[PDB]
RNA sequence: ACUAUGGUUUUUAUU
RNA sequence: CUGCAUGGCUGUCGUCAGCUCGUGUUGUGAAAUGUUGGGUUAAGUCCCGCAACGAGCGCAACCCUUAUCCUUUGUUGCCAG
RNA sequence: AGGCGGCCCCCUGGACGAAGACUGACGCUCAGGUGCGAAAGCGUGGGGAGCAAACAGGAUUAGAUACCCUGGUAGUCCACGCCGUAAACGAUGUCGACUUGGAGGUUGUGCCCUUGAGGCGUGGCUUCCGGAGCUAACGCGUUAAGUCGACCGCCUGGGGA
């Protein structure tokens, strides 16, 4: 990859002192990453993701916030991937042996929807199962055929989903995170410095893995 | 073949309307008899099922130990909160020694030659966390051959 | 203390009380408070658009 | 309006 | 004669809305969570939401009874022609 | 340290600064010594408006030598001495160096049209949060209970003391 996405920095400090190796000279206290410390660095990690895709490892895409909550389930869907757009239901990795009962619920409500088992002129009972199904779609709809756990996790904001990153560290699961200047990398296993909101950054690595889960191999 | 050992089990109670209810909290170890060891802690009703509940973790947790001529290459500390244990090697003969929680960890790894002392809290559920911190603190097993000269 | 303003009449309305600073409506105080809320709610989350 | 004081003793808990 | 020996029987909080079984997480651990919060109900109600999510016992339902129309059927009941 | 407070003009120790100069380890702590008081008290005489132990009464209560109310002496104040004790608390013994951060003040000094609601440097201070570190857990956090060193006192279960 090479340059583009020209930006001027946003917010001040609003920072983590761990980020010294990634930041440029600040003007008017407004802080920015250095393009020469970040673009070659995430291009060097784009190959690490392509190797997991060449081993057919199942990748989970997490984007629970406004800049990525549509793109997480469209920007790479032409290459088939698993996604979370708002919520996990919770304990999704360490309590999966229980949380699978809501995947069993989604399977039952879909085998009912697919045949019209509740489609009647008795509307309140039809809406009862419609609302419960369309509520499960929003948390489990992007992971219902993942057949087990992920082999890698990709997350848009490590300050927001830190409880599931704590699960991933306990289970030995790789974590790729586009950490912002005001985030923290200690729970992250593949650091690829970026942003969580505003610009011209939050869907940048997402727009690049959309080919490296198809090219290879893959 | 792998080996299983109990350290301790203790009664734990909750006071309620019309009396009291109780469970057991157990502490166990699992080892290979040659240099791998792990520990389990857990709480359930009945001693054998509290031991089974502690073994849930001992079937996952393990440390592989760095050794040189059947014993330790160096003296080392192990730390967790108020537990501040110390380990040092012994010669071929007597060498085990140590209290019921530290002795169990040395037994199941075949490391029957270490003068282990607690030098802090002896509390079984915390001196175990300090013991396995010391087994993680061990430096690599051929280090004298790397460290010679420059 | 001010209030030297010459109105021969008591007014059947609130004009300076219970709504601006030292409670109610603004600068609320006690009546049960929450301490995990400031470390739980940071950014919206709703209002764009509910409708 | 306000509204004094309380004699002695008190579970088996196993592997 | 003893519920200071008990199996059973039983009063009652109370129709009060609350309680268990498990798995996860946090905490040195007892313990916490969820069962806390925001509306709102007779009600964990009916939705929303947080590191807590399933399966049970309650709540709610099942079964019984009634206001008006239509139908089936009438003596030892009824009586408009 | 205790603490220090209307203003005005004085007497006066300490601290901080810029350019120079003169010393050349003069740096730290300290057994026993030798010295500071908030308030109340004393030794001796003055001064005496609030206020106020005691004293003197009332109320309340079955009782009230207390609460509460009504009067009120020592005392509070000034000189020359004594008392040496406190949450003297930031529950943090004392000297230096080393250290990723956020937010807010106080005061020198160097260069700039201060053509800047000052700015970028350089010195001395000072407050609320917060990450590494510490720890039984609470608490401490660059002004640390951290880190590495130097020194002086005391403690070893409580009652009894």
Swiss-Prot record, chain A:
Which Pfam families does its entry note?
Ribosomal_S2
Could you give a single Gene Ontology term from the biological process aspect? Answer: ribosomal small subunit assembly
- Residues bearing N6-succinyllysine are 107
The protein's matches in CDD domains, at most eight in alphabetical order, are given as:
RPS2
The question of whether Ribonucleoprotein is a record keyword is answered with yes
Can you cite an annotated GO cellular component?
cytoplasm
Q: Which domain of life is it from?
A: Bacteria
Q: Which PROSITE patterns match?
A: RIBOSOMAL_S2_1, RIBOSOMAL_S2_2
Which GO molecular-function terms appear in the entry?
structural constituent of ribosome; zinc ion binding
Keyword annotations of the record: Ribonucleoprotein, Ribosomal protein
Q: What is the protein's known function? A: Required for ribosomal protein bS1 (rpsA) to bind to the 30S subunit.
Tell me the subunit arrangement. Part of the 30S ribosomal subunit, contacts bS1. Some nascent polypeptide chains are able to cross-link to this protein in situ. In collided ribosomes contacts ribosome rescue factor SmrB.
Question: What's this protein's family per the entry?
Answer: Belongs to the universal ribosomal protein uS2 family.
Please give the name of this protein: Small ribosomal subunit protein uS2
UniProtKB/Swiss-Prot annotation, chain B:
GO CC, sorted alphabetically, is:
cytoplasm; cytosol; cytosolic small ribosomal subunit
Q: What outcome follows a substitution of residue 103 to S?
A: In strain: NEA-319; neamycin resistant
The record, for PROSITE patterns, names: RIBOSOMAL_S5, S5_DSRBD
Report the record's Gene Ontology biological process terms: cytoplasmic translation; maintenance of translational fidelity; response to antibiotic; ribosomal small subunit assembly; translation
Q: Which family is it part of?
A: Belongs to the universal ribosomal protein uS5 family.
HAMAP family the UniProt entry points to: Ribosomal_uS5_B
Its subunit composition reads: Part of the 30S ribosomal subunit. Contacts proteins uS4 and uS8. With proteins uS4 and uS5 encircles the mRNA as it enters the ribosome, which may play a role in mRNA helicase processivity. Can be cross-linked to mRNA. In collided ribosomes contacts ribosome rescue factor SmrB.
- Under which name does UniProt file this protein? Small ribosomal subunit protein uS5
Which species is listed as the source? Escherichia coli (strain K12)
Q: Which gene encodes it?
A: rpsE
From Swiss-Prot, chain C:
Q: Name one GO biological process term.
A: ribosomal small subunit assembly
Which residue ranges have biased composition labelled Basic residues?
Answer: 43-51
The UniProt keywords, alphabetically, are: Ribonucleoprotein, Ribosomal protein, RNA-binding, rRNA-binding
Is Heme included in the keywords of this UniProt record? no
State the Gene Ontology terms under molecular function: rRNA binding; structural constituent of ribosome
Q: Name one GO cellular component term.
A: cytosolic small ribosomal subunit
**Tree of life domain:** Bacteria
Q: What does this protein do?
A: Probbly involved in recognition of ribosome rescue factor SmrB in stalled/collided disomes; fusion of protein fragments to its N-terminus decreases ribosome rescue in the presence of SmrB.
Q: How does it assemble?
A: Part of the 30S ribosomal subunit. In stalled ribosomes contacts ribosome rescue factor SmrB.
State the family it belongs to: Belongs to the bacterial ribosomal protein bS21 family.
Indicate what this protein is called per its UniProt record.
Answer: Small ribosomal subunit protein bS21
Naturally occurring in which organism (per UniProt): Escherichia coli (strain K12)
């Amino acid at each position: 990859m090479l340059k583009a996405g020209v930006h001027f920095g946003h917010q001040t400090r609003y920072w983590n002192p761990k980020m010294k190796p990634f930041i440029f000279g600040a003007r008017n206290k407004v802080h920015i990453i250095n393009l020469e410390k970040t673009v070659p660095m995430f291009n060097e990690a784009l190959a690490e993701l392509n190797k997991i895709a060449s081993r057919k490892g199942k990748i989970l895409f997490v984007g629970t916030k406004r800049a990525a909550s549509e793109a997480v389930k469209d920007a790479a869907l032409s290459c088939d991937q698993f996604f979370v757009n708002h919520r996990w239901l919770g304990g999704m990795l360490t309590n999966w042996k229980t949380v699978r009962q809501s995947i069993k619920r989604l399977k039952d409500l879909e085998t009912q929807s697919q045949d019209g088992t509740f489609d009647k002129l008795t509307k309140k009972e039809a809406l009862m199962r419609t609302r419960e199904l369309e509520k499960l779609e929003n948390s489990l709809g992007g992971i219902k055929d993942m057949g087990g756990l992920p082999d890698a996790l990709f997350v848009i904001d490590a300050d927001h989903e830190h409880i599931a990153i704590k699960e991933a560290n306990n289970l030995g699961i790789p974590v790729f995170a586009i950490v912002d200047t005001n985030s923290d990398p200690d729970g992250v296993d593949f650091v690829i410095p970026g942003n969580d909101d505003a610009i011209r950054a939050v869907t940048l690595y997402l727009g690049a893995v959309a080919a490296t889960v198809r090219e290879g191999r893959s | 073949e792998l080996q299983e050992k109990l350290i301790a089990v203790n009664r734990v109670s909750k006071t309620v309307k019309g009396g009291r209810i109780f469970s057991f909290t157990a502490l166990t170890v699992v080892g290979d008899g040659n240099g791998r060891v792990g520990f389990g802690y857990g709480k359930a009703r009945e001693v054998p099922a509290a031991i089974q509940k502690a073994m849930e973790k001992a079937r996952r947790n393990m440390i592989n130990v760095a050794l040189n001529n059947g014993t330790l290459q160096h003296p080392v500390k192990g730390v967790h909160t108020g537990s501040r244990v110390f380990m040092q090697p012994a010669s071929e003969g007597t060498g085990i020694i140590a209290g019921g929680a530290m002795r169990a960890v040395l037994e199941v790894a075949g490391v029957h030659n270490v003068l282990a002392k607690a030098y802090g809290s002896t509390n079984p559920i915390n001196v175990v966390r300090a013991t396995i911190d010391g087994l993680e603190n061990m430096n690599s097993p051929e280090m004298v051959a790397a460290k010679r000269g420059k | 203390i001010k209030v030297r303003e010459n109105e021969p009449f008591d007014v059947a309305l609130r004009r300076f009380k219970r709504s601006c600073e030292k409670a109610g409506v603004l600068a609320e105080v006690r009546r049960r408070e929450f301490y995990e809320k400031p470390t739980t709610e940071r950014k919206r989350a709703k209002a764009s658009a509910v409708k």
